[PDB]
């Protein structure tokens, strides 16, 4: 039922790839060179929403292996007759050529990586690429559906295995996402090379997400900002009032008529009827989520820096460390800029970090990142930033 070229690729894969292991080809020109054993590279990503595609470097795996010899045998697969849509020009037949997984056992034993490693390999290492080898292609027998001519032997979809090189060569049929082709030495000494996650925006998402809610908080006239801040001054010094306020703001009518400063906050989100203004409730519910992540000592300090107008230094201090330690599942050593210190064991910003789970010493500006401190630190920044947004 193919119709156009990619639409034909879509259906071929939809029909033949039960496990979803195949990589579709996007353009007919790109299908050039994608044969069994072509080396393909995927360059580092610059977006979390799309990754650069596999591209042949027009090199075969035998070109990097010692004992130069012809490629091993390929194994022919089943042929499938699609008969197409939008020996018959209307008809198409696609067949499978694949490398037997057991071929690598003998091949990587009969032959070995040129230890004066291929000039091109040294290029890819500097460029940060992961390198793969094509293990299967689905190709046509004869030219097809030509107002659109597809030359015979055009690849529609392909599978790859990842190369890994540590003074040797191995082929991983099922690597994990993080697997690196170019393994570092025993010393861990490398140079400027795309590495450490194919790029990450851990910090970038947080600042904006806060800012959006901060922008959603722009809906408040500064007068309603003040009384809300009056209400916020209170619950931060009352653990139980904070919990009741959060519960008053869950899913299912007229808001809960909370006594005390939690009431003032609710009155900022309702009409004279007591019914919530969702676009006003929405941003506040977010902040309470951040605050609920924090500790009592953090709540008590957030109040005092608010009243003292000292929310700004801590916001900058937290921001840099979140900037430094991303990705936050990794462990790393951060560096305190003294140009933001405002310091001491009893300093308000010092205590905010201890409550997150970080241990601080007076004799060094280094701080180790603890991945378990991610949520509270992020909520801390969110609280600081949003509380700064209300100004």
């Amino acid at each position, epitope marked *: 039922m193919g119709s156009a070229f990619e639409r034909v690729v879509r259906r071929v894969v939809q029909e033949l790839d039960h496990g979803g292991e195949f990589i579709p080809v996007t353009s007919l020109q790109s299908s050039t060179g994608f044969q069994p054993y072509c080396l393909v590279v995927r360059k580092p990503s610059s977006s979390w929403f799309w990754k650069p595609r596999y591209k042949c470097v027009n090199l075969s795996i035998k070109d990097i292996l010692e004992p130069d010899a012809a490629e091993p045998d390929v194994q022919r697969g089943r042929s499938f007759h699609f008969y197409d849509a939008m020996s018959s020009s209307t008809s198409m037949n696609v067949y499978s050529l694949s490398v037997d997984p057991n071929t690598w056992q003998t091949l990587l034993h009969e032959r070995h990586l040129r230890q004066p490693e291929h000039k091109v390999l040294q290029q890819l290492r500097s460029r940060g690429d992961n390198v793969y080898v094509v293990t299967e292609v689905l190709q046509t027998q004869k030219e097809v559906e030509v107002t659109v001519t597809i030359p015979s032997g055009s690849t529609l979809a392909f599978r790859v295995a990842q190369l890994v090189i540590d003074s040797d060569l191995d082929v991983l049929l099922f690597p*994990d996402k993080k*697997q690196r082709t170019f393994q570092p030495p025993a010393t861990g000494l490398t140079d400027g090379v795309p590495a450490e*996650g194919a790029f990450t925006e851990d910090f970038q998402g947080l600042r904006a997400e806060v800012e959006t809610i901060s922008k959603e908080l722009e809906l408040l006239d500064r007068e309603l900002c003040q009384l809300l801040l009056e209400g916020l001054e209170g619950v931060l010094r009352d653990q139980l009032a904070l919990r009741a306020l959060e519960e008053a703001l869950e899913q299912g009518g007229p808001v809960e008529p909370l006594d005390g400063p939690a009431g003032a906050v609710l009155e900022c989100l309702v009409l004279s009827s007591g019914m919530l203004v969702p676009e006003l409730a929405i941003p506040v519910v977010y902040l309470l989520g951040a605050l609920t992540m924090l500790s009592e000592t953090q709540h008590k300090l957030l109040a005092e820096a608010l009243e003292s107008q000292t929310l700004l230094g801590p916001l900058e201090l937290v921001g840099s460390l979140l900037e430094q330690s991303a990705p936050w599942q990794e462990r790393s050593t951060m560096s305190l800029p003294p140009g933001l210190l405002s310091w001491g064991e009893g300093a308000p910003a010092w205590v905010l970090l201890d409550e997150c789970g970080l241990e601080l010493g007076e004799d060094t500006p280094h701080v180790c990142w603890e991945p378990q401190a991610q949520g509270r630190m992020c909520a801390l920044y969110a609280s600081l930033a949003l509380l700064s947004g209300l100004s």
Partner: nanobody
Amino acid sequence: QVQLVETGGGLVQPGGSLRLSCTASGFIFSANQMNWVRQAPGKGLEWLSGISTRGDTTSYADSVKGRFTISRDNAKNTLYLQMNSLQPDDTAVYFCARVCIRGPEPKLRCDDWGQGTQVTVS
């Protein structure tokens, strides 16, 4: 998911010995460079040792050279660190880390880390 689990930390007398284990799951162990890194109280991360995918080559920091020994059993997917002549300066949380880039300029960075095992020498 990638999971690195350290065990073997604890209290030893000065001049004593400890052996740390790190079992790996979630990736092809024999295809990955592995490391041991410790976090001393109040101190930054100190990279200690590294090992090639097959173990034929290793590297150690001076602070532990001769004292500690890094090894792997690729058939069992485990990383070890034998530590000898421990002193209180070896008291720390000890981590195994997969694929570490200790760029002399930027900082130490590794793809995956264990939860850590505390070693206390006193």
